[PDB]
Design a binder for this molecule. Structure first.
Ligand SMILES: Cc1c(C(=O)Nc2nncs2)sc2nc[nH]c(=O)c12
Ligand SMILES: Cc1c(C(=O)Nc2nncs2)sc2nc[nH]c(=O)c12
Ligand SMILES: Cc1ncc(COP(=O)(O)O)c(CN)c1O
Ligand SMILES: Cc1ncc(COP(=O)(O)O)c(CN)c1O
Ligand SMILES: [Cl-]
Ligand SMILES: [Cl-]
Ligand SMILES: [Cl-]
Ligand SMILES: [Cl-]
Ligand SMILES: [Cl-]
Ligand SMILES: [Cl-]
Lengths: 358, 364
């Protein structure tokens, strides 16, 4: 069964937060949150309430066995103050897949989307409109059984919090990546293709190691052929002339060790629609990248994700071998084009079915 | 060497007793808790004073990194009450060592292992009447350390909470007689990978197993046999380490368990079984990879005596069946006594309940 937006209960805040006057990601929260509880009677009524702490039993399975998943998606405000969510249906789809993998309760994707819309509407004045700014939406679903048994929970909590977010860049600044095969994010037969809290905790130490070695983010390698899987919390794309002499955009396939990014899917959809070069999903190895760089066949390498939309890469430290990636010497033409078509769509400059109006 | 330890100190313990003690049990595992809990907070000025307080809810900021990015780890260890009503913890130092390794892996704050152990001893002392004394019963101790940064940044937290809760637990085997389990051995599900975090007791390793355990039941099995590698190595059973007692391919009787290569949690019971068998000096004790091919051959040749899991939950658990590639493999554990299992159970019982003095026991 599902909670219904029709049953929403609104508790407006009596202690509104002061709004920002330099926005740093994930530190500043809006005045309200969504909360829906689930138990043996099913889902309770959803409520929009003032941002507040959670009260959890010390044995909550969310805290002992990581019965927890989350999402991340942005709302954008156009010039005329219309707020729109980018492809939120895909986030709902992904959140439901995560829930099933952790044996957490199902819900109706459109009911949740409408509750989220209602929440953003309430806090609409928190949505910034300066260039490159957005409102970040963080849904979370956790198990909440007061039992140390490793088992399917009979209680759960679903909540959503919101953060206004500043510009990521106006001009794209590239990043350096540490590529060490010692580090593994996910594996075939694992859960790297679900947005589960458990996938992220172990990366904290690795990211520290990337900084210690003078890099900004982690290029996650997998397997004996040192496959390039993902970069930090972004999918990875390479724009090059492949070994067969064909200009192509390649990104690793959804074979279980990649999170299916919404931006990733959008970039594939956009480039396939242009019909100007080959667009493929295929494994990418460090062997191929090295050879391509030596042959001058690499144009651009970048990450995709909700944080920045598209992020150029200029350097990869592969163990002790420092590799220059010529992205910024090549425009970066494709990155700029993607960033432009997404900006026009996201801020309402071009009407589009990918946007969900609030 | 001039600075005081950054760790919280048992010397600074603060005590608050419950106003309404709950009535003890007259029992499913892990649902019944005692009257008090330990809590310690960590922030930018370090560890606060540890406190024993009435069992109560946690209050967490909704952005807590414990809930978004699984900055969480835990331990599990037991205290046992002897005939002298004396309570003793089993090898708790090893649990403290493992907890600290887990904390470092998740960039959570270090602490002093002996200070935590003393705080835990104090908590159990307060709730001593909760420790059962019936055959096979014990008190399960659940320490937890979680990150608690109020921000969505994936980063080392500047805030953390360490707490400890207690559960009285009934006999694992009703009647005090081991009963065997059946295992599903399907290589599609992989618990952990080399270079991963399977050798740490992190919450993240457990949530993904819930669906797999459900599949095992759906297929008529009781627990999961976790296989690894293209050669289907037997790694662990559910939340237990795995042991095989057999005559090996070289004709030598041995007890074998997989080595600590990174995909195995280093169990305290596992180490104790190795230690115990080595001390006896009656047969070869070895840490070596075990493959399904090896087990299949050993079974066909009548070389397998006993297969069992080890862990804090039951100490030792026999296995009588493994479902692998749609085939049901009978494991003759019970037909072989199970001699070794029974011997291990008895020696552990005598140590844990204080029938024999032993350095492994830590008195409360
Ligand atoms: C969404 C986001 C970040 C992030 O960490 N996102 C995750 N998604 N999953 C796990 S962390 S870092 C970051 N920096 C700037 N602006 C952003 O919007 C932003
Ligand atoms: C400690 C324990 C269990 C357990 O789930 N332990 C974990 N350790 N790590 C993760 S779960 S199940 C169980 N059943 C009976 N008696 C017990 O003492 C017991
Ligand atoms: C591991 C991982 N990979 C890729 C992405 C990019 O996903 P999206 O484009 O949906 O933001 C994210 C962020 N959700 C991530 O956490
Ligand atoms: C994966 C795994 N393996 C083995 C064990 C057994 O560990 P111990 O003997 O320390 O209880 C546990 C429980 N800690 C576990 O969670
Ligand atoms: Cl869509
Ligand atoms: Cl997928
Ligand atoms: Cl953005
Ligand atoms: Cl010891
Ligand atoms: Cl280890
Ligand atoms: Cl026991």
């Amino acid at each position: 069964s599902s909670f219904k937006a029709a049953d929403l209960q609104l508790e407006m805040t009596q202690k509104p937060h002061k709004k920002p006057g330099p926005l740093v990601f994930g530190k500043t929260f809006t005045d309200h949150m969504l909360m829906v509880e689930w138990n043996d009677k099913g889902w309770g009524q959803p409520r929009i309430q003032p941002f507040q702490n959670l009260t959890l039993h010390p044995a909550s399975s969310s805290l002992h066995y990581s019965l927890q998943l989350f999402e991340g998606m942005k709302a954008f405000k156009g010039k005329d103050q219309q707020v729109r969510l980018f492809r939120p249906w895909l986030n709902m789809d992904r959140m439901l897949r995560s829930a099933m993998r952790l044996c957490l309760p199902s819900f109706d994707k459109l009911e949740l989307l409408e509750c989220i819309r209602r929440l953003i509407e309430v806090d609409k004045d928190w949505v910034p409109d300066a260039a490159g700014t957005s409102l970040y939406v963080r849904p979370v679903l956790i198990g909440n059984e007061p039992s140390l048994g490793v088992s399917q929970p009979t209680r759960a909590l679903l909540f959503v919090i919101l953060c206004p977010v500043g510009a990521y860049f106006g001009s794209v600044t590239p990043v350096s990546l540490l590529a060490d095969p010692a580090f593994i994010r996910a594996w075939v037969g694992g859960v790297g293709n679900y947005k589960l809290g458990g996938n992220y905790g172990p990366t904290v130490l690795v990211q520290q190691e990337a900084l210690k070695r003078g890099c900004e983010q982690v290029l996650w390698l997998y397997g004996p052929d040192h496959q390039l899987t993902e970069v930090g919390t972004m999918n990875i794309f390479v724009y090059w002339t492949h070994e067969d002499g064909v200009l192509e955009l390649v990104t690793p396939p959804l074979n279980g060790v990649i999170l299916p990014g919404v931006v990733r899917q959008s970039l594939l959809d956009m480039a396939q629609t242009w019909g100007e070069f080959r667009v493929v999903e295929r494994t990418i190895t460090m062997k191929q990248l090295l050879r391509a760089l030596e042959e001058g066949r690499v144009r651009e390498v970048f990450g995709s994700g909700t944080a920045c939309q598209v992020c150029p890469v200029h350097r990869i430290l592969y163990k002790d071998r420092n590799l220059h990636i010529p992205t910024m010497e090549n425009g970066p033409e494709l990155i700029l084009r993607f960033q432009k078509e997404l900006k026009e769509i996201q801020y309402g400059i071009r009407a589009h079915e990918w946007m969900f109006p609030v």
